[PDB]
């Protein structure tokens, strides 16, 4: 009983900047660690940014560093990823998924549908 919906996607010309949003809901309390992940059509999965809500320790791709930030809104039950200075490679579609631990990737579930991210 945890489900997470991401929005926020769309399309932009490099430089530019998009805030996605990852809406929980149902018993949240265990997920304690929450990442944002992409993937493009004929590519493997990547974690672009990571966030402990208890303690606010975050993590972030090398190539993301400096341009995307992840942040919380506990009243809002939301994690957002503000991505700016947008580059053609950050097209994809983006999806956030939470574990009460963070240690493996494998571990992290209850990602939505996604939303699109195209820069060009």
């Known amino acids: 009983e945890v489900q997470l919906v991401e929005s926020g996607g769309g399309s932009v010309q490099p430089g530019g900047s998009l805030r996605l949003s990852c809406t929980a809901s149902g018993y949240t309390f265990s997920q304690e660690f929450v990442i944002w992940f992409r993937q493009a059509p004929g590519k493997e999965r990547e974690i672009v940014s990571g966030?402990?809500?208890?303690?606010?320790?975050?993590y972030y791709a090398d190539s993301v560093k400096g341009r995307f930030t992840i942040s919380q809104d506990n009243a809002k039950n939301t994690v957002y990823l503000q991505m700016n200075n947008l580059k053609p490679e950050d097209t994809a579609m983006y999806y956030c998924?939470?574990?009460?631990?963070?240690?493996?990737?494998?571990?992290?579930?209850?990602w939505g549908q996604g939303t699109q991210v195209t820069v060009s």
């Open positions: 966030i402990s809500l208890r303690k606010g320790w975050t």
């Open positions: 998924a939470a574990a009460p631990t963070a240690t493996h990737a494998l571990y992290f579930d209850y």
